Amino acid sequence: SVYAWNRKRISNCVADYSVLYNSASFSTFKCYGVSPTKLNDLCFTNVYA
Amino acid sequence: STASALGKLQDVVNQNAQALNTLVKQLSSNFGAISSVLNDILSRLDKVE
């Protein structure tokens, strides 16, 4: 729900943002601090969804 | 025996050293940018923004 949004932690994985980037099933794909296509080289830790 | 009897030359050297030091230190200022390193913002962004 709006007031009870659900949280997930992601760590110790391998991520492929390119396939979802190419996916058109998402209405808005708006990335703020980084370029959406530049996600396959730089990587981070403690991903929060 | 007496120390600091040569204050003028020491002052000149100190002035030069601190000028160079602060010039070096200026490299770590955002100046309004999201970061102070060229490579990282290049690698995380795209060549339009």
Side-chain angles (χ1 to χ4, degrees):
Chain A
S1 57
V2 179
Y3 79 106
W5 40 268
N6 271 111
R7 178 173 276 255
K8 180 57 185 292
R9 184 170 317 264
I10 296 298
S11 68
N12 301 325
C13 295
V14 287
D16 185 16
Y17 314 87
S18 184
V19 287
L20 55 89
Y21 194 10
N22 309 322
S23 172
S25 313
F26 316 118
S27 303
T28 306
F29 199 120
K30 180 38 168 72
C31 294
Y32 280 34
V34 291
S35 169
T37 178
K38 284 264 197 162
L39 300 176
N40 287 34
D41 48 357
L42 269 296
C43 57
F44 276 141
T45 190
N46 288 322
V47 178
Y48 299 102
Chain B
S1 290
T2 305
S4 82
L6 282 81
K8 334 186 74 179
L9 316 177
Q10 205 63 47
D11 288 332
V12 164
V13 173
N14 293 342
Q15 285 184 319
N16 299 316
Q18 60 202 29
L20 292 174
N21 172 50
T22 179
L23 172 57
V24 166
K25 204 184 307 293
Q26 293 297 109
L27 271 74
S28 298
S29 306
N30 310 270
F31 280 101
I34 63 172
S35 298
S36 61
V37 287
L38 295 84
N39 55 5
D40 292 337
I41 71 159
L42 278 156
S43 71
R44 79 178 76 171
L45 296 200
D46 193 0
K47 192 65 174 64
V48 55
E49 78 271 30

Coordinates of all heavy atoms in Angstrom, one line a residue:
Chain A
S1 N 0.8 -1.2 0.0 CA 0.0 0.0 0.0 C 0.9 1.2 0.0 O 2.1 1.2 0.1 CB -0.9 0.0 1.2 OG -0.2 -0.1 2.4
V2 N 0.2 2.4 -0.1 CA 1.0 3.6 -0.2 C 1.7 3.9 1.1 O 2.9 4.3 1.1 CB 0.1 4.8 -0.6 CG1 0.8 6.1 -0.7 CG2 -0.6 4.5 -1.9
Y3 N 1.0 3.8 2.2 CA 1.6 4.1 3.5 C 2.4 2.9 4.1 O 3.2 3.2 5.0 CB 0.5 4.4 4.5 CG -0.2 3.2 5.1 CD1 0.1 2.7 6.4 CD2 -1.1 2.4 4.3 CE1 -0.5 1.6 6.9 CE2 -1.7 1.3 4.8 CZ -1.4 0.9 6.1 OH -2.0 -0.2 6.6
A4 N 2.4 1.8 3.5 CA 3.1 0.6 3.9 C 3.9 0.0 2.8 O 3.9 -1.2 2.5 CB 2.1 -0.5 4.5
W5 N 4.7 0.9 2.1 CA 5.6 0.4 1.1 C 6.5 -0.6 1.5 O 7.0 -0.6 2.7 CB 6.3 1.6 0.5 CG 6.8 2.6 1.5 CD1 6.1 3.7 2.0 CD2 8.0 2.5 2.2 NE1 6.8 4.3 3.0 CE2 8.0 3.6 3.1 CE3 9.1 1.7 2.2 CZ2 9.1 3.9 4.0 CZ3 10.2 1.9 3.1 CH2 10.1 3.0 3.9
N6 N 6.8 -1.6 0.7 CA 7.6 -2.7 1.1 C 9.1 -2.6 0.7 O 9.4 -2.1 -0.4 CB 7.1 -4.0 0.5 CG 6.0 -4.6 1.4 OD1 4.8 -4.7 1.1 ND2 6.5 -5.2 2.5
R7 N 10.0 -3.0 1.6 CA 11.4 -2.8 1.4 C 12.1 -4.1 1.2 O 11.7 -5.1 1.8 CB 12.1 -2.1 2.6 CG 13.6 -1.9 2.6 CD 14.1 -1.1 3.8 NE 14.0 0.3 3.6 CZ 15.0 1.1 3.3 NH1 16.2 0.7 3.2 NH2 14.8 2.4 3.2
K8 N 13.1 -4.1 0.3 CA 14.0 -5.3 0.1 C 15.4 -4.9 0.1 O 15.8 -3.8 -0.5 CB 13.6 -6.1 -1.2 CG 14.4 -7.3 -1.5 CD 14.4 -8.3 -0.3 CE 15.3 -9.5 -0.6 NZ 14.9 -10.3 -1.7
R9 N 16.3 -5.7 0.7 CA 17.7 -5.6 0.6 C 18.3 -6.5 -0.4 O 17.9 -7.7 -0.5 CB 18.3 -5.9 2.0 CG 19.8 -5.7 2.0 CD 20.4 -5.8 3.5 NE 19.5 -5.1 4.4 CZ 19.7 -3.8 4.8 NH1 20.8 -3.2 4.5 NH2 18.8 -3.3 5.7
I10 N 19.3 -6.0 -1.2 CA 20.0 -6.8 -2.2 C 21.5 -6.7 -1.9 O 22.0 -5.6 -1.9 CB 19.6 -6.4 -3.6 CG1 18.1 -6.6 -3.9 CG2 20.5 -7.2 -4.6 CD1 17.7 -8.1 -3.8
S11 N 22.1 -7.8 -1.8 CA 23.6 -7.9 -1.7 C 24.0 -9.3 -2.1 O 23.2 -10.3 -2.0 CB 24.1 -7.6 -0.2 OG 23.7 -8.6 0.7
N12 N 25.3 -9.4 -2.4 CA 25.9 -10.7 -2.8 C 25.2 -11.3 -4.0 O 24.5 -12.3 -3.9 CB 26.0 -11.7 -1.7 CG 26.8 -11.1 -0.5 OD1 27.8 -10.4 -0.7 ND2 26.4 -11.5 0.7
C13 N 25.2 -10.6 -5.2 CA 24.5 -11.0 -6.4 C 25.3 -10.6 -7.6 O 26.4 -10.0 -7.5 CB 23.1 -10.3 -6.4 SG 21.9 -10.8 -5.2
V14 N 24.8 -10.9 -8.8 CA 25.2 -10.3 -10.0 C 24.0 -9.7 -10.7 O 23.0 -10.4 -10.8 CB 25.9 -11.4 -10.9 CG1 27.3 -11.7 -10.3 CG2 25.1 -12.6 -11.0
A15 N 24.1 -8.5 -11.1 CA 23.0 -7.7 -11.6 C 23.1 -7.4 -13.1 O 24.2 -7.0 -13.6 CB 22.8 -6.4 -10.9
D16 N 22.1 -7.6 -13.9 CA 22.0 -7.3 -15.3 C 20.9 -6.3 -15.5 O 19.8 -6.7 -15.8 CB 21.8 -8.6 -16.1 CG 21.9 -8.3 -17.6 OD1 22.4 -7.3 -18.0 OD2 21.5 -9.2 -18.4
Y17 N 21.3 -5.0 -15.5 CA 20.3 -4.0 -15.7 C 20.0 -3.8 -17.2 O 19.0 -3.1 -17.5 CB 20.8 -2.7 -15.2 CG 21.4 -2.8 -13.8 CD1 22.8 -3.1 -13.6 CD2 20.6 -2.6 -12.6 CE1 23.3 -3.2 -12.3 CE2 21.2 -2.7 -11.4 CZ 22.5 -3.0 -11.2 OH 23.0 -3.1 -10.0
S18 N 20.8 -4.4 -18.1 CA 20.6 -4.1 -19.5 C 19.3 -4.8 -20.0 O 18.6 -4.2 -20.8 CB 21.8 -4.7 -20.3 OG 21.6 -4.4 -21.7
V19 N 19.0 -6.0 -19.5 CA 17.8 -6.7 -20.0 C 16.5 -5.9 -19.6 O 15.6 -5.7 -20.4 CB 17.8 -8.1 -19.5 CG1 18.8 -8.9 -20.3 CG2 18.1 -8.2 -18.0
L20 N 16.4 -5.5 -18.3 CA 15.3 -4.7 -17.9 C 15.3 -3.3 -18.5 O 14.2 -2.7 -18.8 CB 15.3 -4.6 -16.4 CG 16.6 -4.1 -15.7 CD1 16.5 -2.5 -15.5 CD2 16.7 -4.7 -14.3
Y21 N 16.5 -2.8 -18.8 CA 16.6 -1.5 -19.5 C 16.0 -1.6 -20.9 O 15.2 -0.7 -21.4 CB 18.0 -1.1 -19.6 CG 18.3 0.4 -20.0 CD1 17.2 1.3 -20.1 CD2 19.6 0.8 -20.3 CE1 17.5 2.6 -20.5 CE2 19.8 2.1 -20.7 CZ 18.7 3.0 -20.7 OH 19.0 4.3 -21.1
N22 N 16.2 -2.7 -21.6 CA 15.6 -2.9 -22.9 C 14.2 -3.3 -22.9 O 13.4 -3.1 -23.9 CB 16.4 -4.0 -23.7 CG 17.9 -3.8 -23.7 OD1 18.4 -2.7 -23.8 ND2 18.7 -4.9 -23.5
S23 N 13.7 -3.7 -21.7 CA 12.3 -4.0 -21.5 C 11.4 -2.8 -21.6 O 11.7 -1.8 -21.0 CB 12.1 -4.7 -20.2 OG 10.7 -4.9 -19.9
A24 N 10.4 -2.9 -22.4 CA 9.4 -1.8 -22.6 C 8.2 -1.9 -21.6 O 7.3 -1.0 -21.7 CB 8.9 -1.7 -24.0
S25 N 8.2 -2.9 -20.8 CA 7.1 -3.1 -19.8 C 7.0 -2.0 -18.8 O 6.0 -2.0 -18.1 CB 7.2 -4.5 -19.2 OG 7.5 -5.5 -20.1
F26 N 8.0 -1.2 -18.6 CA 8.1 -0.2 -17.6 C 7.7 1.2 -18.2 O 8.3 1.6 -19.2 CB 9.5 -0.1 -17.0 CG 10.1 -1.5 -16.7 CD1 11.2 -1.9 -17.3 CD2 9.4 -2.3 -15.8 CE1 11.7 -3.2 -17.0 CE2 9.9 -3.6 -15.5 CZ 11.1 -4.0 -16.1
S27 N 6.7 1.8 -17.7 CA 6.3 3.1 -18.2 C 7.3 4.2 -18.1 O 7.6 4.8 -19.1 CB 5.0 3.5 -17.5 OG 4.0 2.5 -17.6
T28 N 7.9 4.4 -16.9 CA 8.9 5.4 -16.7 C 10.2 4.7 -16.2 O 10.1 4.0 -15.2 CB 8.4 6.5 -15.8 OG1 7.2 7.0 -16.2 CG2 9.4 7.6 -15.6
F29 N 11.3 5.0 -16.8 CA 12.6 4.5 -16.4 C 13.5 5.8 -16.2 O 14.2 6.2 -17.1 CB 13.2 3.6 -17.5 CG 14.3 2.7 -17.0 CD1 14.2 1.4 -17.1 CD2 15.5 3.3 -16.4 CE1 15.2 0.5 -16.6 CE2 16.5 2.4 -16.0 CZ 16.3 1.1 -16.1
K30 N 13.4 6.3 -15.0 CA 14.0 7.6 -14.7 C 15.1 7.5 -13.7 O 14.8 7.3 -12.5 CB 12.9 8.7 -14.2 CG 13.5 10.0 -13.9 CD 14.6 10.5 -14.9 CE 14.9 11.9 -14.8 NZ 15.6 12.2 -13.5
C31 N 16.3 7.5 -14.1 CA 17.5 7.4 -13.2 C 18.0 8.8 -12.9 O 18.1 9.7 -13.8 CB 18.5 6.5 -13.8 SG 18.1 4.8 -14.0
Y32 N 18.4 9.0 -11.7 CA 18.7 10.4 -11.2 C 20.2 10.7 -11.2 O 20.7 11.6 -11.8 CB 18.1 10.6 -9.8 CG 16.6 10.9 -9.8 CD1 15.8 10.3 -10.8 CD2 16.1 11.8 -8.9 CE1 14.5 10.6 -10.8 CE2 14.8 12.0 -8.9 CZ 13.9 11.5 -9.9 OH 12.6 11.8 -9.9
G33 N 21.0 9.9 -10.4 CA 22.4 10.2 -10.2 C 23.4 9.6 -11.2 O 24.5 10.0 -11.2
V34 N 22.9 8.6 -12.0 CA 23.7 7.9 -12.9 C 22.9 7.7 -14.2 O 21.7 7.8 -14.2 CB 24.2 6.6 -12.4 CG1 25.2 6.8 -11.3 CG2 23.0 5.8 -11.9
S35 N 23.6 7.4 -15.3 CA 23.0 7.1 -16.6 C 22.5 5.7 -16.6 O 23.2 4.8 -16.1 CB 24.0 7.3 -17.7 OG 23.5 6.7 -18.9
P36 N 21.3 5.5 -17.1 CA 20.7 4.1 -17.1 C 21.5 3.1 -17.8 O 21.6 1.9 -17.4 CB 19.3 4.3 -17.7 CG 19.1 5.7 -17.7 CD 20.4 6.4 -17.7
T37 N 22.2 3.5 -18.9 CA 23.0 2.5 -19.6 C 24.4 2.3 -19.1 O 25.1 1.3 -19.5 CB 23.2 3.0 -21.1 OG1 24.0 2.1 -21.8 CG2 23.8 4.4 -21.1
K38 N 24.9 3.1 -18.1 CA 26.2 3.0 -17.5 C 26.2 2.2 -16.2 O 27.0 2.4 -15.4 CB 26.8 4.4 -17.3 CG 27.3 5.1 -18.5 CD 28.8 4.9 -18.7 CE 29.4 5.8 -19.7 NZ 30.9 5.9 -19.5
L39 N 25.2 1.3 -16.1 CA 25.1 0.5 -14.9 C 25.8 -0.8 -14.9 O 25.9 -1.5 -13.9 CB 23.6 0.2 -14.6 CG 22.7 1.5 -14.4 CD1 21.3 1.1 -14.3 CD2 23.2 2.3 -13.3
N40 N 26.4 -1.2 -16.1 CA 26.9 -2.5 -16.2 C 28.4 -2.5 -15.9 O 29.0 -3.6 -16.0 CB 26.7 -3.0 -17.7 CG 25.2 -3.4 -17.9 OD1 24.3 -2.8 -17.3 ND2 25.0 -4.4 -18.7
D41 N 29.0 -1.4 -15.7 CA 30.5 -1.3 -15.3 C 30.6 -1.0 -13.8 O 31.3 -1.7 -13.1 CB 31.2 -0.4 -16.2 CG 30.5 1.0 -16.3 OD1 29.4 1.1 -15.8 OD2 31.0 1.9 -17.0
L42 N 30.1 0.2 -13.4 CA 30.1 0.6 -12.0 C 29.2 -0.3 -11.2 O 28.1 -0.7 -11.7 CB 29.8 2.0 -11.8 CG 30.9 3.1 -11.8 CD1 31.8 2.8 -10.6 CD2 31.7 3.0 -13.1
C43 N 29.6 -0.6 -10.0 CA 28.7 -1.5 -9.2 C 28.8 -1.0 -7.7 O 29.8 -0.4 -7.3 CB 29.1 -3.0 -9.3 SG 30.8 -3.4 -8.9
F44 N 27.8 -1.3 -6.9 CA 27.7 -0.8 -5.6 C 27.3 -2.0 -4.6 O 27.3 -3.1 -5.0 CB 26.7 0.3 -5.5 CG 27.3 1.6 -5.8 CD1 26.5 2.5 -6.6 CD2 28.6 2.0 -5.5 CE1 27.1 3.8 -6.9 CE2 29.1 3.2 -5.8 CZ 28.3 4.1 -6.5
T45 N 27.1 -1.6 -3.4 CA 26.8 -2.5 -2.3 C 25.6 -2.0 -1.5 O 25.2 -0.8 -1.6 CB 27.9 -2.8 -1.4 OG1 27.6 -3.9 -0.5 CG2 28.2 -1.5 -0.5
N46 N 24.9 -2.9 -0.9 CA 23.7 -2.6 -0.1 C 22.6 -1.9 -0.9 O 22.3 -0.7 -0.7 CB 24.0 -1.8 1.1 CG 24.8 -2.6 2.2 OD1 24.4 -3.8 2.4 ND2 25.7 -2.0 2.8
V47 N 22.1 -2.6 -1.9 CA 21.1 -2.1 -2.8 C 19.8 -2.1 -2.1 O 19.4 -3.2 -1.5 CB 21.0 -2.8 -4.1 CG1 19.9 -2.3 -5.0 CG2 22.4 -2.7 -4.8
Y48 N 19.0 -1.0 -2.1 CA 17.7 -0.9 -1.4 C 16.6 -0.7 -2.4 O 16.7 0.1 -3.3 CB 17.7 0.2 -0.4 CG 18.8 0.0 0.7 CD1 20.0 0.8 0.7 CD2 18.6 -0.9 1.7 CE1 20.9 0.6 1.6 CE2 19.5 -1.0 2.7 CZ 20.7 -0.3 2.7 OH 21.6 -0.4 3.6
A49 N 15.6 -1.6 -2.3 CA 14.5 -1.5 -3.2 C 13.2 -1.2 -2.4 O 13.0 -1.9 -1.4 CB 14.3 -2.8 -4.0
Chain B
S1 N 73.6 29.6 17.7 CA 72.7 29.4 18.8 C 71.3 29.9 18.6 O 70.3 29.1 18.6 CB 73.3 30.0 20.1 OG 74.5 29.2 20.5
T2 N 71.2 31.2 18.3 CA 69.8 31.8 18.2 C 69.1 31.2 17.0 O 69.7 31.1 15.9 CB 69.9 33.3 18.0 OG1 70.7 33.8 19.2 CG2 68.6 33.9 18.0
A3 N 67.9 30.8 17.2 CA 67.1 30.2 16.1 C 66.2 31.3 15.5 O 66.0 32.4 16.1 CB 66.2 29.1 16.6
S4 N 65.6 31.1 14.3 CA 64.7 32.0 13.6 C 65.4 33.4 13.4 O 64.7 34.4 13.4 CB 63.4 32.2 14.4 OG 63.6 33.1 15.4
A5 N 66.7 33.4 13.2 CA 67.4 34.6 12.9 C 67.3 35.0 11.5 O 67.8 36.1 11.1 CB 68.9 34.5 13.4
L6 N 66.7 34.2 10.6 CA 66.6 34.3 9.2 C 65.2 34.3 8.8 O 64.8 33.6 7.9 CB 67.4 33.2 8.5 CG 69.0 33.4 8.5 CD1 69.6 33.0 9.8 CD2 69.6 32.7 7.3
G7 N 64.4 35.1 9.5 CA 62.9 35.0 9.3 C 62.4 35.3 7.9 O 61.5 34.7 7.4
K8 N 63.1 36.2 7.2 CA 62.6 36.7 5.9 C 62.6 35.5 4.9 O 61.6 35.3 4.2 CB 63.4 37.8 5.4 CG 64.1 38.6 6.5 CD 64.8 39.9 6.0 CE 63.8 40.9 5.6 NZ 64.4 42.2 5.1
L9 N 63.7 34.8 4.8 CA 63.8 33.7 3.8 C 62.8 32.6 4.1 O 62.2 32.1 3.2 CB 65.2 33.2 3.7 CG 66.3 34.3 3.7 CD1 67.7 33.7 3.8 CD2 66.2 35.2 2.5
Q10 N 62.7 32.3 5.4 CA 61.8 31.3 5.9 C 60.4 31.7 5.5 O 59.6 30.9 5.1 CB 61.9 31.0 7.4 CG 61.5 29.7 7.8 CD 62.3 28.6 7.2 OE1 63.6 28.6 7.2 NE2 61.7 27.5 6.6
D11 N 60.0 33.0 5.7 CA 58.7 33.5 5.4 C 58.4 33.3 3.9 O 57.3 32.9 3.5 CB 58.6 34.9 5.8 CG 58.5 35.1 7.3 OD1 58.0 34.1 7.9 OD2 58.9 36.1 7.8
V12 N 59.4 33.7 3.0 CA 59.2 33.5 1.6 C 59.0 32.1 1.2 O 58.0 31.8 0.5 CB 60.5 34.1 0.8 CG1 60.4 33.6 -0.6 CG2 60.5 35.6 0.9
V13 N 59.8 31.2 1.8 CA 59.6 29.8 1.5 C 58.2 29.3 1.9 O 57.5 28.5 1.2 CB 60.7 28.9 2.1 CG1 60.5 27.5 1.9 CG2 62.1 29.3 1.5
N14 N 57.8 29.7 3.1 CA 56.5 29.2 3.6 C 55.4 29.8 2.8 O 54.4 29.1 2.5 CB 56.4 29.7 5.1 CG 57.3 29.0 6.0 OD1 57.9 28.0 5.7 ND2 57.5 29.6 7.2
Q15 N 55.5 31.0 2.3 CA 54.5 31.6 1.5 C 54.3 30.7 0.2 O 53.2 30.4 -0.2 CB 54.8 33.0 1.1 CG 54.6 34.0 2.3 CD 54.8 35.4 1.8 OE1 55.8 35.7 1.1 NE2 54.0 36.3 2.3
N16 N 55.4 30.4 -0.5 CA 55.4 29.6 -1.7 C 54.8 28.3 -1.4 O 53.9 27.8 -2.1 CB 56.8 29.5 -2.3 CG 57.4 30.8 -2.7 OD1 56.7 31.7 -3.2 ND2 58.6 31.0 -2.3
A17 N 55.2 27.6 -0.3 CA 54.7 26.3 0.0 C 53.2 26.3 0.2 O 52.5 25.4 -0.3 CB 55.5 25.8 1.2
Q18 N 52.7 27.3 1.0 CA 51.3 27.3 1.3 C 50.5 27.6 0.1 O 49.4 27.1 -0.1 CB 51.0 28.2 2.5 CG 51.4 29.6 2.2 CD 51.5 30.4 3.5 OE1 51.9 29.9 4.6 NE2 51.3 31.7 3.5
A19 N 51.0 28.5 -0.8 CA 50.3 28.8 -2.0 C 50.1 27.5 -2.8 O 49.0 27.2 -3.3 CB 51.0 29.8 -2.8
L20 N 51.2 26.8 -3.0 CA 51.1 25.5 -3.8 C 50.2 24.5 -3.1 O 49.4 23.8 -3.7 CB 52.5 24.9 -4.0 CG 53.4 25.7 -4.9 CD1 54.8 25.1 -4.9 CD2 52.9 25.7 -6.3
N21 N 50.3 24.5 -1.8 CA 49.5 23.5 -1.0 C 48.0 23.8 -1.2 O 47.2 22.9 -1.4 CB 49.9 23.5 0.4 CG 49.0 22.7 1.3 OD1 48.7 21.5 1.0 ND2 48.5 23.2 2.4
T22 N 47.6 25.0 -1.0 CA 46.2 25.3 -1.2 C 45.7 25.2 -2.6 O 44.6 24.8 -2.9 CB 45.8 26.8 -0.7 OG1 44.4 27.0 -0.9 CG2 46.6 27.8 -1.5
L23 N 46.6 25.5 -3.6 CA 46.2 25.2 -5.0 C 46.0 23.7 -5.2 O 45.0 23.3 -5.9 CB 47.4 25.6 -5.9 CG 47.2 25.2 -7.4 CD1 45.8 25.7 -7.9 CD2 48.3 25.8 -8.2
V24 N 46.8 22.8 -4.6 CA 46.5 21.4 -4.7 C 45.2 21.1 -4.0 O 44.4 20.3 -4.5 CB 47.7 20.6 -4.1 CG1 47.3 19.2 -3.8 CG2 48.9 20.7 -5.0
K25 N 45.0 21.6 -2.8 CA 43.8 21.3 -2.0 C 42.5 21.7 -2.7 O 41.5 21.1 -2.5 CB 43.9 21.9 -0.7 CG 43.0 21.2 0.4 CD 43.1 22.0 1.7 CE 44.5 22.2 2.1 NZ 45.2 20.9 2.4
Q26 N 42.6 22.7 -3.6 CA 41.4 23.2 -4.3 C 40.8 22.1 -5.2 O 39.6 22.3 -5.6 CB 41.6 24.4 -5.1 CG 41.9 25.6 -4.3 CD 40.8 26.0 -3.4 OE1 40.9 25.9 -2.1 NE2 39.7 26.5 -4.0
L27 N 41.5 21.0 -5.5 CA 41.0 20.0 -6.4 C 39.9 19.2 -5.9 O 39.3 18.4 -6.6 CB 42.2 19.1 -6.8 CG 43.0 19.6 -8.0 CD1 43.9 20.7 -7.7 CD2 43.8 18.4 -8.6
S28 N 39.6 19.3 -4.6 CA 38.6 18.5 -3.9 C 37.3 19.3 -3.6 O 36.7 19.1 -2.5 CB 39.1 17.8 -2.7 OG 40.2 16.9 -3.1
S29 N 36.9 20.2 -4.4 CA 35.8 21.1 -4.2 C 34.7 20.8 -5.2 O 35.1 20.8 -6.4 CB 36.2 22.6 -4.2 OG 37.2 22.8 -3.3
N30 N 33.5 20.6 -4.8 CA 32.4 20.3 -5.8 C 32.2 21.4 -6.7 O 31.8 21.2 -7.9 CB 31.1 19.9 -5.0 CG 31.4 18.9 -3.9 OD1 31.2 17.7 -4.2 ND2 31.7 19.4 -2.7
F31 N 32.4 22.7 -6.3 CA 32.1 23.9 -7.1 C 30.6 23.9 -7.6 O 30.3 24.6 -8.5 CB 33.0 24.0 -8.3 CG 34.4 24.5 -7.9 CD1 35.5 23.7 -7.8 CD2 34.5 25.9 -7.7 CE1 36.7 24.2 -7.4 CE2 35.8 26.4 -7.4 CZ 36.8 25.6 -7.3
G32 N 29.8 23.1 -6.9 CA 28.4 22.9 -7.4 C 28.2 21.6 -8.2 O 27.1 21.2 -8.4
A33 N 29.3 20.9 -8.6 CA 29.2 19.6 -9.3 C 28.9 18.5 -8.3 O 29.1 18.7 -7.1 CB 30.5 19.3 -10.1
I34 N 28.4 17.4 -8.8 CA 28.0 16.3 -8.0 C 29.1 15.6 -7.3 O 29.0 14.9 -6.3 CB 27.1 15.3 -8.8 CG1 28.0 14.7 -9.9 CG2 25.9 15.9 -9.3 CD1 27.3 13.5 -10.6
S35 N 30.3 15.8 -7.8 CA 31.5 15.2 -7.3 C 32.7 16.0 -7.7 O 32.6 17.0 -8.5 CB 31.7 13.8 -7.7 OG 30.6 13.0 -7.2
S36 N 33.9 15.7 -7.2 CA 35.2 16.4 -7.5 C 36.1 15.5 -8.2 O 37.4 15.7 -8.1 CB 35.8 16.9 -6.2 OG 36.1 15.9 -5.3
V37 N 35.7 14.5 -8.9 CA 36.5 13.6 -9.7 C 35.9 13.4 -11.1 O 34.7 13.1 -11.2 CB 36.7 12.2 -9.0 CG1 37.6 12.4 -7.8 CG2 35.3 11.7 -8.6
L38 N 36.7 13.7 -12.1 CA 36.2 13.7 -13.5 C 35.8 12.3 -13.9 O 34.8 12.0 -14.5 CB 37.3 14.2 -14.4 CG 37.7 15.7 -14.3 CD1 38.7 15.8 -13.2 CD2 38.2 16.3 -15.6
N39 N 36.7 11.3 -13.7 CA 36.5 9.9 -14.2 C 35.2 9.3 -13.7 O 34.5 8.7 -14.4 CB 37.7 9.1 -13.7 CG 38.0 9.1 -12.2 OD1 37.2 9.7 -11.5 ND2 39.0 8.5 -11.8
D40 N 34.9 9.5 -12.4 CA 33.7 8.9 -11.8 C 32.4 9.4 -12.4 O 31.5 8.7 -12.8 CB 33.7 9.0 -10.3 CG 34.9 8.3 -9.6 OD1 35.3 7.3 -10.3 OD2 35.3 8.6 -8.5
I41 N 32.3 10.8 -12.5 CA 31.1 11.3 -13.1 C 31.0 11.0 -14.6 O 29.9 10.9 -15.1 CB 31.1 12.9 -12.8 CG1 32.1 13.6 -13.6 CG2 31.3 13.1 -11.3 CD1 31.8 15.0 -13.8
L42 N 32.2 10.9 -15.2 CA 32.1 10.4 -16.6 C 31.6 9.0 -16.7 O 30.8 8.7 -17.6 CB 33.5 10.6 -17.2 CG 33.9 11.9 -17.7 CD1 35.4 12.1 -17.8 CD2 33.3 12.2 -19.1
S43 N 32.1 8.1 -15.8 CA 31.8 6.7 -15.9 C 30.4 6.4 -15.4 O 29.8 5.4 -15.8 CB 32.8 5.9 -15.1 OG 32.6 6.1 -13.7
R44 N 29.8 7.3 -14.6 CA 28.4 7.1 -14.1 C 27.4 7.8 -14.9 O 26.2 7.4 -14.8 CB 28.4 7.5 -12.7 CG 28.2 9.0 -12.4 CD 28.1 9.3 -10.9 NE 29.4 9.2 -10.3 CZ 29.6 9.6 -9.0 NH1 28.6 10.1 -8.3 NH2 30.8 9.4 -8.5
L45 N 27.7 8.8 -15.7 CA 26.8 9.5 -16.5 C 26.9 9.2 -18.0 O 27.7 8.4 -18.4 CB 27.0 11.0 -16.2 CG 26.7 11.5 -14.8 CD1 26.5 13.0 -14.8 CD2 25.5 10.8 -14.2
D46 N 26.1 9.9 -18.8 CA 26.2 9.8 -20.2 C 26.7 11.1 -20.8 O 26.7 12.1 -20.1 CB 24.8 9.5 -20.8 CG 24.9 9.0 -22.2 OD1 26.0 9.0 -22.8 OD2 23.8 8.7 -22.8
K47 N 27.1 11.0 -22.1 CA 27.7 12.2 -22.7 C 26.6 13.1 -23.3 O 26.7 13.5 -24.5 CB 28.7 11.7 -23.8 CG 29.6 12.8 -24.4 CD 30.5 13.3 -23.4 CE 31.5 14.3 -24.0 NZ 30.8 15.5 -24.6
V48 N 25.6 13.5 -22.5 CA 24.8 14.6 -22.8 C 24.6 15.5 -21.5 O 24.7 16.7 -21.6 CB 23.4 14.2 -23.3 CG1 22.7 13.2 -22.4 CG2 22.5 15.4 -23.6
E49 N 24.4 14.8 -20.4 CA 24.2 15.5 -19.1 C 25.4 15.8 -18.4 O 25.5 16.8 -17.6 CB 23.2 14.7 -18.2 CG 23.9 13.5 -17.5 CD 23.9 12.2 -18.4 OE1 23.9 12.3 -19.6 OE2 23.9 11.1 -17.8

